[PDB]
Design a protein around this nucleic acid. Structure first.
Lengths: 116, 61, 46, 121, 212, 37
RNA sequence: UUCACAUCGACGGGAAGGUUUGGCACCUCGAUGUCGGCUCUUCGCCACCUGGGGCUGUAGUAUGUUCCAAGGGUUGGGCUGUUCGCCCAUUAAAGCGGUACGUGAGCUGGGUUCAGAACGUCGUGAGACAGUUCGGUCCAUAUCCGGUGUGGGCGUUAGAGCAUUGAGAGGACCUUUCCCUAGUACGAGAGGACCGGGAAGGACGCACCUCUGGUGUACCAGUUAUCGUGCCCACGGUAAACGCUGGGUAGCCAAGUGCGGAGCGGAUAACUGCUGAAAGCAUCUAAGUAGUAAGCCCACCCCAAGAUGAGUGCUCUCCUA
RNA sequence: CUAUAACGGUCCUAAGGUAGCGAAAUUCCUUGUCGGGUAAGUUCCGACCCGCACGAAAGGCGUAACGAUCUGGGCACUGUCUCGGAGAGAGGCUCGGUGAAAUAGACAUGUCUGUGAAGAUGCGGACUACCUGCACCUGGACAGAAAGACCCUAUGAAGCU
RNA sequence: GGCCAGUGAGACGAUGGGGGAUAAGCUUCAUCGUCGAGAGGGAAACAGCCCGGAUCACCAGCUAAGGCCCCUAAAUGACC
RNA sequence: AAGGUCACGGCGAGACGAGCCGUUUAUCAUUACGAUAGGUGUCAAGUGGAAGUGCAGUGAUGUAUGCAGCUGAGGCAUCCUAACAGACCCACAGACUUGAAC
């Protein structure tokens, strides 16, 4: 039974799931709009809201935790120079979960992530 | 479960158990099982076809 | 585990038609999605 | 929680050192012996200047335990060892000086253990 | 047949009441979303039995269908979600027109019974439904935790009905009995009751006096 | 009680009474209080 | 001590049961897998305990034997492959059996002692022992019935949303010490009640996470080896599905916490009776009728009108051509 | 004194078992009796010798070291257990693709009880069951295998003496 | 006699016995009946028990064994 | 048509079906309903003093900022994001017959 276990685990083990989270939110912050599955979409939604509001207060500690979470070096330093100028006054809700057709070969419920 | 226990509890299952073993228990005695209308009260709620009393041929009752 | 005998044409057409009726149930959903995919402001299907 | 194969230390100077307790009396659970339950001990080793030798079946009282002790006052008392008092069925032990502290609920049935105790918490 | 009308309330967590004597008692906290308005009484004349029908959880009218809200507006009361009766012996004096009954009737009655949906545990095995034992974990064994033997030999030729198999454990309502009442709150709309009600905080809960 | 299924009335006051189908034997001495066959 | 029948009952006799060893060889060898253990039933009474009673060579405690009663229980262990059995600590008691070992298409050891080897004995020998010892593969995705859960269709005579009655069925109805009565009846003492209450337990069951914890791969903290982040700091990856540890919220769980097992409710079995005749005496009965069992039913908790006998009550909607 | 036989005679052999061992890998009775270990020990060790049926190169009695050898006991250690509980993966469940197999007379394939080639969904009487899926469990279909390795028969086969 | 087959495992029931335990649906014989190789009716079902011997048709009648409350045909027939 | 089903956002419900709770000018005001899930802001709560700087020390390290820093499966608030767009099933007095009064 799963009463109140609000972690959203995928079809992958724990450390591989962490690497899926970090890599897919990294390239989500790289391209902005991205094609995922819906489980991967909500799993991106929590963590990428944590990474938008993490470097919202652009200190050194937030920048070092944020650089520790994201893989690529030059994308964290392109983030806190962009998120207070764009996502000020939004106060949560930084994405959008536009769904699409299922994937040929799996009938996988396929989703599509914005930044709005 | 004995006879006085049903007759104290639900009496209209007595006669309903007596005549159910008198009818051919296939698909057709099950259809004419519903023709039986047993009521424990002194008055029956039927005014269907002005029910005439049943003719007996039994001299020992 | 090993089946004792085989099934009839009876039970097999029942089970196969329950399988294909289970395929019938998942296309009026696709008719609804194909009808909502048409002209209208829907915030999906980029 | 005192299983029927545990080792309990002695809480008196009756003449033993530890004991393999066997199959408690009173509470018929016998796979969970809480405080105040007498146990049919056997002597694993003893003091060899006393009429309590090896392999001797005796009755004792569980007076300390590593398992908790729910009190109505809100407190929960627990020790770090297991202890018994080599007892007789008429109340008092045959060892006078009680070692270590005990609780105070067992005063309602075993008053001589409390009266001979160094600390009653 | 119950010995009196009861109320229904929702569970709101558990805590510990400190009695001034010094004891510490584990109590469940009961809230009341809306007053348990008597909606429909069914007497011996127009029905085969006698029961008082109350309800709970005043809502928005969109949440409630046309037969439901038509039934509730037949009594001239607020539209509400939950709805249950208590069968009561024919000495009753209850009008179905908006009797917003207050919760004072349980404090002197220091015994109450409660019913509620226990938390479901889904399709659980025989090791936790019916308190079986597992096999040997080692010594070359293979029937770990399994159900073991199911029936007797050739002469039955089947298994007895009602035999303890795995199945869906929780989800049905239960009633735990003679639960002694404690400190009500006439302003916090909260009743302390020393025990453990069926279910997590949030569910409906029948709160009706004892049947001993 | 004595279920002696076939012993005779043995004291001089063993009256013989069939009650409730069964045959019993009563006497002044409670030794002889029997229920027969 | 007298005394066949409180209790045993010699010499004999009459039955029931199919649980041992047997007899027959009637189904099965194009295969019905023996003995023990684990798990999990269910049933019988020829009753070990619990409930009621009679008799006692029953003063009371405890009995001996026996009647009704199978609802419930019938421990943990040392030996042995063990069934059985012996012993220890107890317990109210540690019942005997059926269900093909009850149960190996649920699971494991001694064995129909399989193939290797050794000891004794037999045989000239190959080899053999209803003698002993060591080692020795055990398969499997449920077609159908059966079961436990959970739907979908259709029916319930318009279509629905709720609300319940309850036919029927399940579970629970178990049990022990300690105290008052009372050291009172009884007994020369020693001992020590029935009956009616209370309290603490045990198993079982239904729940819950407030406390105490176990886990908790959401988590945070310490540290080893190493590779990356250009480098120091500080982090990230890996050391399976936590690198190893230290704790933990919410879940789940118990060892923890609450609750349950109620009924001057109905009828009975054994028994005690009240009037009371067939034989003007009598007798528990032939007429009527009273006390009373953990047993039966109801009440108790849940499911429950597919109860096709398909229930009852309230409410909504059937419009245009 | 009860014993037991140092010792004796007799029958038959080729000779009637020497040292040492001895309820043993050997002992049926037997869980022999005693002592140790254990709360309790048909297993173990130390003894007695009543050795069914030890015994001196088919060697006997011993012992250091050695053994994935057998067996008895103890310390530490732990889910083996009391008495289970939680968590992580691969399956299992659902969806999309691909897609078998053993088996199979036809199956419109209930329970009790009785009968019957003596253990019946198929026969009889009664009771109970709306139809049909899905997920688990395996009591029955004397379930699947595979012309019973055990037992016996063959005027069978073969190895060996 | 000629040509030419099978069969040579029997089973139960009555009587006459032996083996047994005058136990077995047990075993072996002797006479007979049935089944084997025999359908139908009665026996609830059910090889051997009773009636009975099926060429075939009839939407014909009378009977044997056995039955005449209902399931299920015929008497809730009569008198002791 | 009433009422359902799909979809949609999920659940203290759950193998799948089920079930349950939402499905937005998602109050306005004098006092119980129109916050479903995520994010955000705070409060319980867990580990427990983070980085950076200064100071002391030859250095390991300790100390102040600082119950700070992360965690936020739980509570409340907040419409910032997604609850948009839909679709489909069920309709049109409910056969036949007696009795009663209107």
């Amino acid at each position: 039974m799963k009463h109140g276990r609000k972690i959203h685990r995928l079809s992958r083990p724990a450390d591989q799931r962490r690497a899926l989270l970090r890599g897919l939110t990294t390239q989500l912050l790289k391209h902005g709009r991205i094609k995922t599955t819906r489980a991967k979409a909500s799993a991106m939604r929590k963590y990428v809201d944590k990474m938008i509001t993490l470097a919202k207060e652009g200190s050194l500690h937030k920048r070092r935790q944020a650089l520790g979470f994201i893989y690529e070096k030059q994308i964290v330093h392109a983030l806190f120079a962009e998120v207070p100028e764009r996502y000020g006054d939004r106060n949560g809700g930084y994405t959008r979960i536009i769904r699409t057709l299922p994937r040929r070969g799996d009938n996988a419920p396929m989703a599509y992530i914005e930044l709005v | 479960e004995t006879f006085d226990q049903l007759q104290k509890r639900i009496p209209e299952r007595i006669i309903e158990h007596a005549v159910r073993g008198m009818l051919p228990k296939g698909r057709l005695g099950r259809y004419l099982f519903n023709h039986l209308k047993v009521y424990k009260g002194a008055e029956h709620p039927h005014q269907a076809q002005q029910p005439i009393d049943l003719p007996l041929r039994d001299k020992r009752i | 585990a090993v089946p004792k005998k085989r099934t009839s044409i009876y039970k097999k057409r029942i089970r196969k038609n329950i399988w294909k009726k289970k395929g019938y149930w998942a296309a009026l959903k696709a008719f609804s999605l194909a009808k909502s995919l048409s002209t209208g402001n829907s915030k999906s299907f980029f | 929680m005192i299983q029927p194969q545990t080792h309990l230390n002695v809480a008196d100077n009756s003449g033993a050192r530890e004991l393999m307790c066997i199959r408690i009396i009173g509470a018929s659970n016998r796979r969970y012996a809480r405080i105040g339950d007498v146990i049919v001990a056997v002597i694993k080793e003893a003091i060899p200047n006393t009429p309590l030798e090896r392999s001797e079946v005796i009755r004792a009282v569980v007076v300390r335990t590593c398992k908790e002790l729910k009190r109505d006052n809100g407190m929960i008392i627990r020790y770090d060892d297991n202890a018994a008092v080599i007892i007789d069925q008429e109340g008092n032990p045959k060892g006078t000086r009680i070692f270590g502290a005990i609780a105070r609920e067992l005063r309602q049935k075993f008053a001589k253990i409390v009266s001979l105790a160094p600390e009653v918490l | 047949v119950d010995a009196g009308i009861g109320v229904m309330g929702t569970k709101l967590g558990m805590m510990s009441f400190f009695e001034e004597d010094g004891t510490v008692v584990p109590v469940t906290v009961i809230g009341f979303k809306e007053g348990n308005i008597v909606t429909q009484v069914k007497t011996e004349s127009t029905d085969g039995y006698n029961a008082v029908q109350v309800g709970y959880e005043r809502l928005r009218d969109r949440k409630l269908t046309m037969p439901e809200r038509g039934h509730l507006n037949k009594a001239g009361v607020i539209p509400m979600r939950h709805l249950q009766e208590f069968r009561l012996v024919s000495v009753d004096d209850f009008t179905p027109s908006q009797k917003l009954l207050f919760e004072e009737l349980f404090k002197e009655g220091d015994m109450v019974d409660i019913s509620g949906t226990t938390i479901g545990k889904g399709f659980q095995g025989g090791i936790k439904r019916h308190n079986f034992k597992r096999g040997l974990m080692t010594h070359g064994s293979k029937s770990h935790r399994a159900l073991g033997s199911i029936g007797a030999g050739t002469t039955p030729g089947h298994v007895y009905k009602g035999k303890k198999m795995p199945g869906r454990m929780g989800g049905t309502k239960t009633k735990i009995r003679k639960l002694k009442i404690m400190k009500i709150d006439t302003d916090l709309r909260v009743v302390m009751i020393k025990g453990a009600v069926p279910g997590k905080p949030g569910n409906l809960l029948r709160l009706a006096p004892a049947k001993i | 009680m004595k279920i002696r299924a076939s012993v005779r009335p043995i004291c001089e006051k063993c009256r013989l009474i069939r009650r409730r189908g069964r045959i019993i034997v009563i006497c002044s001495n409670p030794k002889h209080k029997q229920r027969q066959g």
